[PDB]
Design a protein around this ligand. Structure first.
Ligand SMILES: CCCCCCCCCCCCCCCCCC(=O)OC[C@H](COP(=O)([O-])OCC(O)COP(=O)([O-])OC[C@@H](COC(=O)CCCCCCCCCCCCCCCCC)OC(=O)CCCCCCCCCCCCCCCCC)OC(=O)CCCCCCCCCCCCCCCCC
Ligand SMILES: CCCCCCCCCCCCCCCCCC(=O)OC[C@H](COP(=O)([O-])OCC(O)COP(=O)([O-])OC[C@@H](COC(=O)CCCCCCCCCCCCCCCCC)OC(=O)CCCCCCCCCCCCCCCCC)OC(=O)CCCCCCCCCCCCCCCCC
Ligand SMILES: CCCCCCCCCCCCCCCCCC(=O)OC[C@H](COP(=O)([O-])OCC(O)COP(=O)([O-])OC[C@@H](COC(=O)CCCCCCCCCCCCCCCCC)OC(=O)CCCCCCCCCCCCCCCCC)OC(=O)CCCCCCCCCCCCCCCCC
Ligand SMILES: CCCCCCCCCCCCCCCCCC(=O)OC[C@H](COP(=O)([O-])OCC(O)COP(=O)([O-])OC[C@@H](COC(=O)CCCCCCCCCCCCCCCCC)OC(=O)CCCCCCCCCCCCCCCCC)OC(=O)CCCCCCCCCCCCCCCCC
Ligand SMILES: CCCCCCCCCCCCCCCCCC(=O)OC[C@H](COP(=O)([O-])OCC(O)COP(=O)([O-])OC[C@@H](COC(=O)CCCCCCCCCCCCCCCCC)OC(=O)CCCCCCCCCCCCCCCCC)OC(=O)CCCCCCCCCCCCCCCCC
Ligand SMILES: CCCCCCCC/C=C/CCCCCCCC(=O)OC[C@H](COP(=O)(O)OCCN)OC(=O)CCCCCCC/C=C/CCCCCCCC
Lengths: 62, 99, 50, 200, 50
């Protein structure tokens, strides 16, 4: 399993390793925090649908 | 020791105004040329440097970059390899580092 | 450190790296709360329906 | 009308307990008694009359029988809490209607709002000062005690008195006004010159 | 401090990463369990002392 962590490194040379995983081209235009916005914002969207539950009893929805 | 204690090495003058505490002036403060006068002065220098100070610049830039190295043995290696075999004391005179 | 650094001091290096998440929906929640506070101000003092 | 029963059920909540369905458990009023009303003694007489009619005025039957609590008041604090969360402004409005029938002057209302908002403002600054002390602690200065009311030989700053005199001379530091120097934008001159050198 | 309104005890775990290894849905599972045992403690006490 320790040799399985280095599988993608054996097929590559050192120059290919650096150009692949180290020298990632700079691109600072992405919306990285969209991952947190969709997850945490989903609580609010879930409440919109959850507030319309056809549960008859008010205290059941409580 | 008071927490808001400062030791200043230049003279300051404090304003004697109610409800406020600040430095209202500095003794013997001389106002120089304005931002526009400095701009016109700097443009005269940059214009001369653009017109008559660009010939043979690549050699001087290489000598200046070699002298920013950490050790002297690396500076000499830089002068010999990059600057066409220049001498340490001779290049330091061109750059103005010699007394 | 010898030429351009200061004294070598011992500190505790915090591995936890906090960062306030800059979100969009948090301002929606904030506006809703202030909308409730302002409506209560109107409900108590500027409601003439009775 | 046609949509009355559907809409009335949709608008308000009813009671689901059948506490009073059991006959003998029904209270006579001795569980929750009003103590200070001017008709207090008339309330006690009606409780006594209710107890006497249940036993045909042989109260020894009540002494031997079992006494029950008021089951109708069960979970009443939870039920009010859920109504307060369901519609907080509607709960506050109706619970304060009788109190709001007497409206104080514009001056008194302004004093309530002013002192209340002024107290919250000082609380917000007190919270921000606690973050300053935490940054001071992490910066390497251990802190004995707390607060900014220095007992020793230090200057204090009490906070802006919420009166127009000090509110005209002073104003709090707006953090959004502390900016990066605009000379940073002059580094973009390096980009324009590089683009021309590379023939872009 | 998670139950205080506008806490100023910034050094009491307010600015630290605090995870646990208990059951999640804390106020639904763990917190009621602590209250259930509380009711047992006092009901057992009332029965004993009386
Ligand atoms: C044509 C007729 C029908 C024929 C087909 C019938 C078959 C249909 C099924 C197949 C088709 C489904 C299509 C989508 C494929 C998804 C497949 C899938 O497996 O998803 C599993 C899906 C996700 O699995 P998951 O990874 O476990 O995520 C849920 C975790 O809780 C997440 O928790 P978390 O902590 O990991 O993350 C927090 C989470 C926040 O999540 C929560 O907080 C919710 C937690 C639930 C409440 C908490 C209490 C837990 C209750 C436990 C008991 C529940 C058991 C229920 C079991 C049901 C089993 C299905 O926030 C987010 O992660 C991001 C959320 C925001 C992202 C954007 C979401 C967009 C959704 C789609 C939008 C467009 C739809 C239209 C809008 C709705 C219609 C008006 O599980 C669900 O079932 C979610 C149910 C949510 C309610 C859905 C109600 C709407 C249903 C839409 C139906 C069609 C529209 C209506 C048509 C009306 C006429 C018919
Ligand atoms: C061997 C392995 C297993 C070991 C197991 C060991 C444990 C044994 C398990 C069983 C223990 C109990 C034994 C059976 C008792 C049965 C007694 C009975 O017949 O029912 C009486 C009682 C009667 O209630 P009721 O007559 O219908 O109405 C109450 C009154 O009308 C009053 O209603 P109210 O509307 O006027 O409200 C006032 C109310 C409550 O009003 C309140 O103010 C309390 C507020 C509590 C919630 C808030 C907490 C604050 C923190 C959260 C903040 C919430 C924020 C929400 C809002 C958001 C922000 C705005 O006052 C009360 O405290 C009532 C509590 C019951 C009376 C007991 C004496 C109370 C004095 C002690 C007070 C301190 C404890 C309070 C705990 C309250 C929990 C309900 O019913 C119960 O107590 C039900 C409890 C049974 C639940 C069984 C659950 C399953 C059991 C297994 C669970 C497994 C747990 C594992 C734990 C693991 C170890 C950590
Ligand atoms: C509090 C006691 C100690 C606490 C122990 C607990 C005691 C158990 C009881 C507690 C439970 C009840 C609490 C008291 C409630 C008041 C009693 C009551 O209900 O009587 C009915 C009462 C009706 O009064 P009334 O006597 O039948 O007839 C009055 C006539 O209109 C005209 O009458 P007038 O011509 O003869 O005189 C005019 C004026 C009489 O003049 C005044 O009342 C002077 C008021 C000037 C401003 C006072 C500001 C209070 C300080 C708050 C600032 C934060 C506190 C921390 C900073 C300061 C530290 C000291 O009328 C009144 O306002 C009557 C109220 C007088 C007694 C209540 C005053 C309480 C002030 C607090 C005392 C100090 C507390 C320190 C805090 C402690 C915290 C550790 O209901 C009211 O309407 C008056 C209450 C105030 C309402 C003003 C308008 C507010 C509108 C706000 C709109 C914005 C809200 C937006 C919605 C929010 C978002 C959804
Ligand atoms: C052609 C004729 C002139 C034009 C006529 C047209 C006028 C149209 C009138 C329409 C009325 C406005 C309709 C909408 C208002 C409804 C909402 C309302 O506020 O009613 C309050 C309503 C009625 O109050 P009230 O208990 O029946 O008392 C009514 C009167 O006060 C009477 O009760 P009182 O007799 O017992 O009052 C005795 C009075 C006794 O006063 C005196 O004897 C002398 C007063 C001298 C004042 C000294 C000034 C000193 C200045 C020093 C300044 C130093 C600092 C300056 C720094 C600046 C920068 C350097 O002292 C007071 O208490 C006055 C009350 C406060 C007055 C504030 C404004 C004063 C200046 C008015 C400017 C208008 C000038 C018109 C020209 C008149 C020439 C004859 O009560 C409420 O509070 C419920 C509403 C909740 C309000 C709380 C939040 C208020 C903020 C929002 C209000 C709405 C937006 C803003 C509108 C304007 C408000 C200031
Ligand atoms: C052609 C076919 C087309 C359709 C094909 C597909 C059909 C459906 C297949 C579904 C595929 C699987 C679905 C996966 C999607 C899951 C998405 C999701 O949101 O999951 C989140 C949810 C939470 O997980 P999580 O957030 O991801 O956290 C991860 C770990 O759990 C965290 O670990 P932890 O240990 O830290 O967590 C502690 C643990 C706590 O410990 C527990 O696990 C709790 C377990 C105790 C309850 C166990 C008994 C439940 C059954 C009682 C009723 C029995 C009736 C029959 C009795 C027969 C007696 C012999 O978890 C919780 O904290 C649970 C709290 C969240 C839920 C609590 C409240 C739920 C609402 C309850 C009221 C519902 C009212 C009904 C209204 C209907 C509409 C909504 O996942 C689940 O709970 C899985 C539930 C799976 C279904 C359970 C069976 C429900 C049966 C209900 C019976 C009544 C209705 C019968 C209808 C019959 C229809 C035929
Ligand atoms: C009818 C159209 C109405 C549109 C709204 C009217 C207002 C128009 C005003 C818009 C002005 C545009 C200014 C620029 C906004 C910038 C938007 C933005 O930053 O998006 C970034 C980013 C792009 O990701 P990256 O590839 O990493 O970044 C590349 C950058 N070049 O966008 C996102 O993160 C995706 C999220 C977009 C917004 C949320 C979309 C979901 C909204 C819900 C409604 C959709 C309902 C139906 C959804 C189907 C679901 C099954």
């Amino acid at each position: 399993d320790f040799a399985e962590l280095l599988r993608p490194l054996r097929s590559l040379s050192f120059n290919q390793v650096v150009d692949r995983y180290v020298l990632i081209p700079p691109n600072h235009t992405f919306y990285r925090n969209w991952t947190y916005e969709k997850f945490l914002g989903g609580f609010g969207l879930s409440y919109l649908i959850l507030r319309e539950l056809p549960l008859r009893n008010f205290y059941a929805r409580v | 020791m008071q927490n808001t204690t400062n030791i200043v090495h230049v003279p300051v003058h404090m304003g004697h105004t109610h409800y406020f505490d600040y430095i209202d002036s500095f003794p013997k403060l001389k106002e120089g040329p304005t931002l526009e006068e400095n701009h016109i002065t700097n443009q005269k220098i940059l214009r001369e440097q653009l017109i008559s100070g660009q010939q043979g610049l690549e050699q001087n830039l290489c000598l200046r970059n070699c002298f920013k190295l950490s050790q002297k043995r690396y500076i000499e290696f830089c002068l010999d390899r990059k600057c066409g075999g220049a001498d340490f004391q001779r290049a330091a005179t061109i750059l103005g580092y010699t007394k | 450190t010898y030429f351009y650094g200061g004294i070598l001091e011992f500190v505790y290096f915090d591995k936890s790296n906090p960062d306030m998440c800059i979100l969009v929906h948090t301002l929606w929640i904030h506006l809703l709360i202030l909308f409730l506070i302002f409506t209560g101000f109107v409900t108590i003092l500027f409601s003439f329906y009775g | 009308s046609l949509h009355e029963k559907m809409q009335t059920d949709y608008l308000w909540v009813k009671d689901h307990s059948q506490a009073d369905s059991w006959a003998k458990a029904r209270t006579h009023g001795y569980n929750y008694i009003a103590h200070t009303v001017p008709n207090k003694k008339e309330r006690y007489e009606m409780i006594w009359r209710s107890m006497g009619k249940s036993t045909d005025w042989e109260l020894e039957k009540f002494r031997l029988g079992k006494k029950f609590p008021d089951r109708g008041n069960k979970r009443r604090w939870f039920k009010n809490l859920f109504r307060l969360i369901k519609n907080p402004m509607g709960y506050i409005f109706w619970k304060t209607y009788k109190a709001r029938l007497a409206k104080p002057s514009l001056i008194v209302t302004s004093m309530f709002i002013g002192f209340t908002l002024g107290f919250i403002k000082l609380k917000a600054q007190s919270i921000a000062y606690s973050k300053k002390q935490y940054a001071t602690l992490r910066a390497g200065k251990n802190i004995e005690g707390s607060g900014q009311v220095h007992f020793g030989y230090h200057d204090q700053k009490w906070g802006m008195p919420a009166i127009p005199m000090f509110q005209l001379m002073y104003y709090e530091l707006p953090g959004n006004s502390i900016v990066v120097n605009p000379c940073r934008n002059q580094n973009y001159r390096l980009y324009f010159e590089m683009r021309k050198k590379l023939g872009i | 401090n998670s139950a205080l309104i506008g806490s100023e005890n910034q050094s009491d775990s307010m600015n630290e990463l605090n995870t646990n290894f208990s059951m999640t849905y804390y106020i639904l599972t763990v917190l009621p369990g602590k209250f259930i045992y509380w009711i047992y403690e006092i009901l057992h006490t009332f029965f004993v002392v009386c």
